[PDB]
Amino acid sequence: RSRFKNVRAVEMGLTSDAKIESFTKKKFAEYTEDEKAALAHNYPAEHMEAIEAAEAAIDPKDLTIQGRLRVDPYRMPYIDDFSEIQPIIDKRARRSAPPSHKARFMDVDEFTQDLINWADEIRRGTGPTDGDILSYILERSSMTDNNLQANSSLAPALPDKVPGVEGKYRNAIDPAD
């Protein structure tokens, strides 16, 4: 006897060990050599290492004898690879460099040089566009830290129109007033 009962495997017609193998190879066939190449050409190197190991760890015989469907309240409501980090539905990424301790807020002299440096970087790629001027008030650091873009701890914002919230409100205020 094993840890599990064969009651569920004997009714379908998998009483024998050789019968369970015909089901695994038919239902849980391993990836073909062609699929691996295509799968290794789309995903990066590191992501492929975890895939090849999972197909060796998770043997197909386990999925047949004891594999069941997940119905718990913690199952993910959708299917996704979770390969990258998405804007809203994922925690904000932190890939910046640590801040400088000796950094200080620029002065009128240092501020001018930074403003001059910004005017020469955009004049090397009329004049400054609205996107460059808008990327200077929100991304140009005014600290003596070599224009560091520190990782923000601000939680990711929500979509422009949240599902379940949009389409239900009317603005009582009137511009004519």
């Binding site: 990258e84 998405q86 804007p87 990424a93 422009d160």
Partner: protein
Amino acid sequence: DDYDAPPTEEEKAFLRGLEQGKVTEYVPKLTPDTLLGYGPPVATDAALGKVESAMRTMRILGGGLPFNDQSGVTSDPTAIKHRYVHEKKPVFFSSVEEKEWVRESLDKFAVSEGPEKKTKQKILETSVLGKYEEPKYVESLTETVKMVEKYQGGTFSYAPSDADKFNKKLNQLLAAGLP
């Protein structure tokens, strides 16, 4: 005339990237070295359990903070310099990247690379080798001093300094009740 133009479509799309975020990369990485420091400090026969108990002792000397190798590299330079210099106590860095951030944050501050030789033996002596001082068996009940050391050596509540405070007053009393 005080009118402000509504946010343009270009500007809206730009703010989204900052607020909502962008599609960054993610690289899986998991090796025993990335798990070293979070393991259980157990005195097993497996070297992994003993290497973790030594890492734990370095954290008690460093201040006792947990081994957090995923919450950044910042720290307190003004306080680590005082502890490392004005108090002359050790300092524990969860990673080398955190060690170089305090260097680039202080004006001419030098942090020793590694501990000294003796400090490495004192850690392996008790945390890894586990060398104790067997409490001897006292037969006669009149052996006051010997009997006290027996009890003080069989419990971690009495520290080396507390036992000395005890033995100081005890020996003072025994000597004051003689002819």
